[PDB]
Amino acid sequence: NCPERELQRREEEANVVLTGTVEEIMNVDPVHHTYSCKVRVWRYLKGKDIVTHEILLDGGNKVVIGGFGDPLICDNQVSTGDTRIFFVNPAPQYMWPAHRNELMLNSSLMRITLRNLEEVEHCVEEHRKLL
């Protein structure tokens, strides 16, 4: 078993949460031993406004996500054609230019099922109620 933070904590530590399809595996980051992929976004579950103002989208619905293969994350691998729920954050400036204009994976990838979609949306809405 691989220890994973509670859903509550994960939603809290990820400013952007989206669903999408892996279209292409891109380059490797030899320093952190991770890789990036081009992902066609379907819908945002959180942080859509953050992506709109800080990321230059390709073709209007495609983004690059990096950090796959990270040892700190339990479910961290993908192949072309995979569909998942991604918990990510825009890459900080100190990770530029290697990860410039990329969203970085923050916690385990989740499969696309209505149960997962419902639970994640609820956790996002609850955290928003404290507002």
The torsion angle over the Cα atoms of residues 123, 127, 130 and 131, rounded to 10 degrees, is -130
Please provide the size of the chain in residues: 131
**Separation between Cα atoms, residue 16 and residue 85, nearest integer Å:** 11
Which residue from 87, 125, 104, 81 is spatially nearest to 4, judged by alpha carbons? 87
Paired with 90 in beta bridges are 103
**3-class SS of residue 121:** helix
Q: Which two tokens stand for residue 11?
A: 């939603």
Is-cis flag, bond preceding 3, omega within 30?
no
Domains of the chain: 1-131 (2.40.50.120)
Technique used to solve these coordinates: X-ray
Give the residue carrying structure tokens 């953050």: 50
The torsion angle over the Cα atoms of residues 113, 118, 121 and 124, rounded to 10 degrees, is -110
83: left (phi over 0), alpha (psi -120 to 50) or beta: beta
Q: How close are the terminal C-alpha atoms of the chain, in Å? A: 35
Residues 121/129, Cβ–Cβ less than 8 Å: no
**Separation between Cα atoms, residue 90 and residue 73, nearest integer Å:** 17
**Separation between Cα atoms, residue 92 and residue 89, nearest integer Å:** 8
**3-class SS of residue 33:** coil
Which residue from 75, 74, 63 is spatially nearest to 20, judged by alpha carbons? 63
Q: Which two tokens stand for residue 54?
A: 């800080």
**3-class SS of residue 116:** helix
**Separation between Cα atoms, residue 21 and residue 124, nearest integer Å:** 22
**By CB neighbour count within 10 A (0-12 exposed, 13-18 middle, 19+ buried), where does 1 fall?**
exposed
**Separation between Cα atoms, residue 48 and residue 69, nearest integer Å:** 25
